[PDB]
Amino acid sequence: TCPFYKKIPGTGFTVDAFQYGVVEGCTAYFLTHFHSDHYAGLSKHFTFPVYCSEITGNLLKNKLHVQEQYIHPLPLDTECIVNGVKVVLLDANHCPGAVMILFYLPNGTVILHTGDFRADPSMERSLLADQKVHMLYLDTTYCSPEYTFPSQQEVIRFAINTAFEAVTLNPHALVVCGTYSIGKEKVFLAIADVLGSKVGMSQEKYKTLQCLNIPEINSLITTDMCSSLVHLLPMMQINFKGLQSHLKKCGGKYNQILAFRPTGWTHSNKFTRIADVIPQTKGNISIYGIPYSEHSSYLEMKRFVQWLKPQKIIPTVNVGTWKSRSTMEKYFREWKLEAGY
Ligand code: NI
């Protein structure tokens, strides 16, 4: 059955709750973003109302084949009424079309559901600042102090300079970027822009990008692999064997590969800075691991919550074991005692 952390008290709403069949009492199902864990269970067979951003609606329609009559897209930063209740969608700074939802309950309680998010200080001057928020449903992915990472901009700068140098040294080098869902598109778009190239990709991946309301998208991407010097492949193929194999397929148009694996955190965040990063190399193929995150670091999450001063926090990630819940509760209490709420 649908857990209490996916239910909004004193409404018939749920959030990211599509895997449990019909939820008893639910009149509207919200979807924060188009990642499979969150949408799991949605298909052309679903016949209840779904509320979401415009981008998330394009994806539901075109990729999942959810029928149009059930898609209710809402604009961002706008007070809207849903089934008698005031809501606002806000940018979550996660992947394209990802939202946080603000719910103003009839009794006067205010609830923020973050979805998946990367906390940023620009969120401190949104509509959130206008009133007290009583309850917070929080993306706790990286809720432990070891989880540090550079800014998105530091990581992009590094990727840009690295790719530019390699292709100026060898104009027959190909650049490859790994991918498994939506998100982290700036990696491959910024590399292609410094090289004066479009991004080449499969038909399925191109169809995904064509849903994302990216300005001038037709000038940035193509299905003609031949004509382009940055290619996208599934993350699973970003290894020496997969990359040599792809290089055979391209028709000796390239004689070297430089590849990027954008990942979350892995244990080497605790010493290395982005400027120290060096690749793994075997022959004419090099692979760089770059920690481009679309989730809050511990420090970014702590700042956001200390500003917001919620009366209660409800975790939405790593809630499956008592040890994790216990550890998270300890950090929430520290934050509260330091900030005085
Ligand atoms: Ni996500």
User: What's the sign of the alpha-carbon dihedral 140, 141, 143, 149?
Assistant: negative
Distance 296 CA to ligand 1 centre (A): 12
Distance CA 242, CA 26 (A): 46
Asked whether the beta carbons of 110 and 310 are under 8 A apart, the reply is no
Task: Report which residue type is found at 329.
Answer: E
Asked whether the beta carbons of 279 and 103 are under 8 A apart, the reply is no
Distance CA 40, CA 195 (A): 38
CA 286 from chain center: how many Å? 26
Give phi and psi for 44, each to the nearest 5: -55, -15
- Token pair for 169: 């040294």
Distance 256 CA to ligand 1 centre (A): 33
Tell me, in Å, the resolution of the deposited structure: 2.0
Angle at 225 between CA 251 and CA 61, to 5 degrees: 150
**Virtual torsion, Cα 310, 19, 76, 203, nearest 10 deg:** 140
Distance 231 CA to ligand 1 centre (A): 23
User: What's the sign of the alpha-carbon dihedral 35, 40, 45, 47?
Assistant: negative
Q: Tell me the β-bridge partners of 100.
A: 90
SS3 state of residue 248: helix
- For the domain 148-295, what is the CATH code? 3.40.50.12650
Residues of the chain within CATH 3.60.15.10 domain(s) are: 1-147+296-341
End-to-end Cα spacing for the chain = 34
Instruction: Find all residues with CB under 8 Å of 169, minimum gap 6, and list them.
Output: none
- For the domain 1-147+296-341, what is the CATH code? 3.60.15.10
- Token pair for 7: 């239910």
Residues of the chain within CATH 3.40.50.12650 domain(s) are: 148-295
277: number of Cβ within 10 Å: 16
Q: Tell me the β-bridge partners of 192.
A: none
Helix/strand/coil percentages in the chain, nearest 5: 35, 20, 45
**Virtual torsion, Cα 26, 49, 114, 138, nearest 10 deg:** 30
Instruction: Find all residues with CB under 8 Å of 308, minimum gap 6, and list them.
Output: 112, 128, 133, 136
Distance 56 CA to ligand 1 centre (A): 12
Distance 116 CA to ligand 1 centre (A): 5
Distance CA 170, CA 92 (A): 39
Provide DSSP, 286-332.
EEEEE---SS--HHHHHHHHHHH--SEEEE-SS-SSHHHHHHHHHHH
Distance CA 327, CA 323 (A): 6
CA-wise closest residue to 308 among 105, 102, 52: 102
Distance 263 CA to ligand 1 centre (A): 13
Distance 233 CA to ligand 1 centre (A): 20
